Symmetry: C5
Subunit: 270 residues, 5 copies
Amino acid sequence: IIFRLLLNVLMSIIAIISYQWYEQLGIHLTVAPFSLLGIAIAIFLGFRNSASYSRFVEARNLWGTVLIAERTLVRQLRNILPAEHDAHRRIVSYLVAFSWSLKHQLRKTDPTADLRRLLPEERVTEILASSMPTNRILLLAGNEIGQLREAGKLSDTTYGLMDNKLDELAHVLGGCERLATTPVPFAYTLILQRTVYLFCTLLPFALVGDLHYMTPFVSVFISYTFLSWDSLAEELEDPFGTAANDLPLNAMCNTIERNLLDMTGQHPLP
Amino acid sequence: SKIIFRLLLNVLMSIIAIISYQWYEQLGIHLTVAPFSLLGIAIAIFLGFRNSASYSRFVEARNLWGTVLIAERTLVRQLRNILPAEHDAHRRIVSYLVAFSWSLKHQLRKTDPTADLRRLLPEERVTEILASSMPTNRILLLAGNEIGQLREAGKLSDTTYGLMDNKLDELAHVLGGCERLATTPVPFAYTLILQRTVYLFCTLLPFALVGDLHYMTPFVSVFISYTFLSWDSLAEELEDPFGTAANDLPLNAMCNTIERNLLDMTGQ
Amino acid sequence: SKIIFRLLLNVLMSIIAIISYQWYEQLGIHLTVAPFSLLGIAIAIFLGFRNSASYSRFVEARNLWGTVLIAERTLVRQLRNILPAEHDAHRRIVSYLVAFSWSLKHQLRKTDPTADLRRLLPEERVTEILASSMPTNRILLLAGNEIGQLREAGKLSDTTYGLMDNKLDELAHVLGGCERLATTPVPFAYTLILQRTVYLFCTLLPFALVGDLHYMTPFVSVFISYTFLSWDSLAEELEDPFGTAANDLPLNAMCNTIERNLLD
Amino acid sequence: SKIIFRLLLNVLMSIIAIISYQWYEQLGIHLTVAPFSLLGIAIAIFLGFRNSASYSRFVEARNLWGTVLIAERTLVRQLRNILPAEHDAHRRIVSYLVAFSWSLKHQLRKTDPTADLRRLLPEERVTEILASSMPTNRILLLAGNEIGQLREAGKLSDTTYGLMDNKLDELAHVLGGCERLATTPVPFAYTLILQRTVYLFCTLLPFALVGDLHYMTPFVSVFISYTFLSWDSLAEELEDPFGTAANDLPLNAMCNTIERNLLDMTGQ
Amino acid sequence: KIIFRLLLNVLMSIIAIISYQWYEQLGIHLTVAPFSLLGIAIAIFLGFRNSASYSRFVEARNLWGTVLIAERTLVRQLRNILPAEHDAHRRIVSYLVAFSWSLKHQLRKTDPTADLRRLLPEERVTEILASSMPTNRILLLAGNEIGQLREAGKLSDTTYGLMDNKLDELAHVLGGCERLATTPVPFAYTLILQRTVYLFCTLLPFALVGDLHYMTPFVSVFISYTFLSWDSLAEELEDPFGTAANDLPLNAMCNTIERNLLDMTGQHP
Ligand SMILES: [Zn+2]
Ligand SMILES: [Zn+2]
Ligand SMILES: [Zn+2]
Ligand SMILES: [Zn+2]
Ligand SMILES: [Zn+2]
Ligand SMILES: [Zn+2]
Ligand SMILES: [Zn+2]
Ligand SMILES: [Zn+2]
Ligand SMILES: [Zn+2]
Ligand SMILES: [Zn+2]
Ligand SMILES: [Zn+2]
Ligand SMILES: [Zn+2]
Ligand SMILES: [Zn+2]
């Protein structure tokens, strides 16, 4: 990815050799048109990166919500039903399974190992048999809260109170799904990039007349700026993508798992 | 896309510029990139904002359909958790929800939903739905009738009824939101003004440049024009979210997803 | 609208510049483009942001009316699902909700809502409503009176009463929001800076463009003028979305749509 | 406002730049336009973003007060619909709400609220409230006390008590919101950055413009200065939305409207 | 510390002035117009980024306000619904205050043991310090007070709901501040950005010098002051929980909250 900076620092060299056998032909290149084009592209990059950042933020918010919902849900389970600890274990397993399964869903990885670690094989087989595993997990948690309801351990009021949290989690799932099926531009988001590329490659060809052989330095500077901003944009557009960062999601799933364990007395150890 | 018309027309004007540059002093006419830069800058800025609007709105449509999926899922989930034995009810309400999805899709797309409705629901109900001048809202009303029936039966308390009714509300905010998007577009005096200015600017910019560029104008003028037009475009696409075009929302696939999801949660 | 006038104006100013250009020499006036480029780009930016704010106001107003339709719909639906056999209260409540929509429309469009109220409600409480300084809110209080008259003696429990009350508050938030957008506008430094700032820039512009544009000059000055005037003007009507202009909200159509929906 | 006392100054800096223009090379100082175009554009952008923040702050305030009006309206409405015979509660709670509006308004305006309280409330509770360092919150507490008495009296079920408590939450969020906007101020730095960067830029501009504009320097300099200073002064009271200046929130009018409304919604 | 590299680019401007015919000998030329373009782009990017940072600051402050609000309404409900259970008022309040301080320390990455021991009995403090999220544990303990309050019939499930909603508000606050703490602005943003501003500011005089001559350092220091100030302000806003000048007075907010909860329970400091 330093390859294009390099690439045509070399166009800045070809630019100069190119500048020299010159005016026999009609080619001329001033700075003012590429300044206009460059400002326009900069503006477009500004807006675009803004949208990308907005997507990133929304993802981080949704996952934050996961953590929050699962914490409050477990808290409620402890405050309302302080004695039902096998239900605690199960429901917590389900929430943690929801988190991991979600990560694996967004990252197109296999959730099988994490599920098999957290849940009994019958319910793991069922969830993996489904094409929408995470929703099946939520459904199963719901089944647990409902079982607590028909047993008379939960009134419908407090059942409501926990159902609200499961809603929160559902909204999250849907939101992350929408953000994953995205982005919305049908690979036009790409189109701009090659516009930036062609602009950065033709730029030293237009500065050369004025900057002479300071050209590679100024051109690699400007190219660095635009290209870096573009790549930042593309990585923000794709928070759950193939070339995205492992740390957000993994730490979030670990964080919540730890939290839940700690809340349920499974932590800490005797 | 259609964008080849802008670029080749611009090439041709660029050529007219090349050949007719020698007749500028004799008419008096000469041109500076300087004023043109100002113009194209103010335009670049406007386009940016107008695309903020278009994108925001596109996104809002995606959000709404997302809310369909979420609300229906949770509604079925609640039905299972509260009334796990009422499977007939389950599949009645499911059928209405899927019908709501399809009818919504059909409405935003101006297609006859009679076939899908009669595929999901018994004929009497289809009649009730098509009798209304607002079929999708009456679909909500019929799902609401089922939930209500469950309430009067005593199977649902007013609390749990309320819990489900909230989901019906979410669905209603969806229907309204989609209708509002459908009928209220981004004021396209935006698209009017911007199209005029951008077009005139792209046809005038080989004339904004010519003297300076010569043998290298179709390449640079096309490059600039293309940038503005490929950019001016992201409105074409980000404002037909309910259209059938390749770039609009795959409402067919979304509805399929919803139906498959609600049938997955009911064992069929 | 009258943009054309101020465009024509630019054009005459432009010809003046054309005939006066090298008499700048005899007057000691030199004017290059670069400072006007700066000023014009700053103005463009500012016009960009203001326009964005306007559009936002427009969008939220629209949303508030969308919320009207949605709240009233669900409220009726709840009435038919919880109390399917009390059509009496249903027609009363619906007539109130519709009178609410029209009264609100007339309130934001400064107009007399008497006729439509009479058309939708019985004379007695049309006089009660017109007696109030805030009719729309009075209408809401009446619809609430209907629902309370449904809680009182057993048909609605507290819970389901809550379910309908919530929707009445959705509506009340709409009322408050619309009042906020209508009563408190944008702070009138808004074209109170952008009016001459933009036209003064557009009329002084050909004086600086004549140097280099020479003969082709007015075309470009009317072009730039068109752009800035047309954008500062798109703020014209997006800032008053309850206004009567073309790009303002078709509130009349929206109410019709609302009561068509409730009467179906 | 007193912005013209910066325009006259600018005209003086312009005439000084005119009379000193070609001691420039005789002093060794050269000033082209391009760096001031760059600098001016950057400043313009930053001004645009700052002014945006300011605008959004003012709007937030407006929304807050709108929420006060709404929440109080709905609270009184609920009181009349749930407890139509309890005109005592109507009276005392409405007084408490109006008192909340005024207390908040005086709190934001840094004025004494006691006259309005004595006008609206009996004195033992007024002294109670004035004794507390957070009076407004205390007024919410008291309103809550009465809704709580209605609950314990069995006139309100826990459900209905919840339905009004949600309105007290709405009001509390408002109080916390206004307190936030007032105590937490704007990040000042934007103002120290733009005040001197704009002022300095406006005064230094004619020295870089005199070269090419010559005698036309004061007009163009005072114009550009007028634009940047007018945009900066457009911000000035928006980042302080609770101020007494003419172009900020009519909190008097708003609180009069509120009291007017709550008395209209009770029959006075 | 902006004065350090203000002086530096002043010095680098002096390096440009006192000197440079070297390119003319060398063949290297540098005009303003390309640096104008680059400077405008950078200015745009700085604008957007600063805007985002500000948004983050505003989010933080908003969240803390929500702490104060949620706690207030929680105490209010506790007084209005259970006026006689005053020991519970004091305990729950001490929990809410402990929550505020522990959150402060959590965002500041400091030890909350002193403030915990100040507000809570040693057993609870020990129970809390063992948790991976002490604030969460605090919420869980307050909830246990409210839940205990539910099971001897002192609160109905509905009213227990009403308060639990406030605990959910608080938990949303916690999750959001946690997210603003763990979510740095992506480094790639300042990696490009601020280095690009420093480099732009130090290279600018070399390009301004050909047209400005001896005026270079004044225009260069002006521009550098602008860009660096704007940038620095953005830095400052991105870390709203830091001890730096432009950042949240979490101490002031915490004792404002404590004074408030003490005000509402008739108690004095
Ligand atoms: Zn446990
Ligand atoms: Zn642990
Ligand atoms: Zn939902
Ligand atoms: Zn079933
Ligand atoms: Zn609603
Ligand atoms: Zn009926
Ligand atoms: Zn001429
Ligand atoms: Zn409300
Ligand atoms: Zn009364
Ligand atoms: Zn009495
Ligand atoms: Zn709250
Ligand atoms: Zn107490
Ligand atoms: Zn929550």
